[PDB]
Every structure is written in C-alpha cells, then in structure tokens.
Amino acid sequence: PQMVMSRDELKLRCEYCRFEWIHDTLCVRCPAQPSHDQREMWLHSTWMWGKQQ
C-alpha cells in the first residue's frame, strides 16, 4: 500500500474504505479495490532500539 507522509495526507477515497489500526500505525483499508490502501509511514511492527533508533 502507498505510504502517506503523515495522518493529514490520508483520505478516504471510496464508499467502502475504512480507518484501521495496524499496531498503533494508522492506515486505510478498502475491502473492495485494494489499490486504495494507504499506510501512514512509521516504524516497523517489530523494532529494537539499536536496530531502529
């Protein structure tokens, strides 16, 4: 899914599109037309301190 720079650049493009949480990372999922999927760019779901800042 395309990664938006921040939460403000995140819009709901269709009728069926939703806001969802991927482990504290806010994202948009459409059960129809998956090309509408948007992630907020943020840390990986699994990160250590030295590995990711």
Q: Does 30 count as an annotated binding residue? A: yes
7 scored as a contact of other proteins (CB under 8 A)? no
- Contact yes or no for 42/3 (Cβ under 8 A): no
Distance in Å, CB of 14 to other proteins, minimum: 6
24 scored as a contact of other proteins (CB under 8 A)? no
Per-residue tokens: 39: 């992630």
Q: Is 8 helix (H, G, I), strand (E, B) or coil?
A: helix
d(CA 45, CA 53): 14
Q: Does 36 count as an annotated binding residue? A: yes
Which option in Zn ion, other proteins, none does residue 12 bind, with CB closer than 5 to 8 A by kind? other proteins
